[PDB]
Write a protein that binds this ligand. Structure first.
Ligand SMILES: NC(=O)C1=CN([C@@H]2O[C@H](COP(=O)(O)OP(=O)(O)OC[C@H]3O[C@@H](n4cnc5c(N)ncnc54)[C@H](OP(=O)(O)O)[C@@H]3O)[C@@H](O)[C@H]2O)C=CC1
Ligand SMILES: CCc1nc(N)nc(N)c1C#CCc1cc(OC)ccc1OC
Length: 157
């Protein structure tokens, strides 16, 4: 299975200055739950911003850099390489990867951040005409989680 995994705001903002625009522990938990034991595929800029591979799953980085060889990370140099990865593969970001893969994935796991943030990177536009809502779950608000959010699982019609 090939899935997108993304958190975007009301205007599809996903990032600002190579970082996430918001702080939301519950969404980190969501990512951990979904992708532990599976595979994340991410672009070079996203990886470098994270700074190290995420524990307990396969980390795959897409880059043109022939010198990229990082401990605990597998490198790919083409989009076509993604389709050779076994198991459940999550396209993890950032903007460039989402733009390349939105028309190809089976599935999308989207956290809608119910606010409007300043961004410089965006998830591509999509229409519910193309996607069935398999599930929609309101995020619980906390002292630690203060931005309303909704976990959507969308399946390509
Ligand atoms: N909120 C969210 O759900 C998420 C947000 N983000 C955010 O997204 C932003 C980063 O996005 P963006 O700037 O697009 O960067 P990306 O993370 O998508 O990385 C882009 C890089 O990936 C490599 N790459 C992409 N496609 C190919 C290809 N076909 N062949 C070879 N290499 C390729 C290139 O690396 P190179 O130049 O080295 O060749 C390219 O410069 C950040 O702000 C981050 O915070 C990221 C993930 C999730
Ligand atoms: C944790 C944010 C997130 N949520 C969802 N639902 N999907 C995603 N693809 C992402 C992401 C990301 C990239 C990223 C993660 C991170 O913590 C692991 C720290 C920095 C990041 O990029 C700036």
């Amino acid at each position: 299975t090939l899935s997108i995994l993304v958190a975007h705001d009301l205007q599809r903002v996903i990032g600002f200055e190579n970082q996430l625009p918001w702080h939301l522990p519950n969404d980190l938990k969501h990512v951990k739950k979904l992708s532990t034991g599976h595979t994340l595929v991410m672009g070079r800029k996203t990886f470098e911003s994270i700074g190290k591979p995420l524990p307990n799953r396969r980390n795959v980085v897409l880059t043109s850099d022939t010198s990229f060889n990082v401990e605990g990370v597998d490198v790919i140099h083409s989009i076509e390489d993604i389709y050779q990865l076994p198991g459940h593969v999550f396209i993890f970001g950032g903007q460039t990867l989402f733009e390349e893969m939105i028309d190809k994935v089976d599935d999308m796991y989207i956290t809608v951040i119910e606010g409007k943030f300043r961004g410089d990177t965006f998830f591509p536009p999509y229409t519910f005409e193309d996607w069935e809502v398999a599930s929609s779950v309101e995020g619980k608000l906390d002292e630690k989680n203060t931005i309303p959010h909704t976990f959507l699982h969308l399946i390509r019609k």
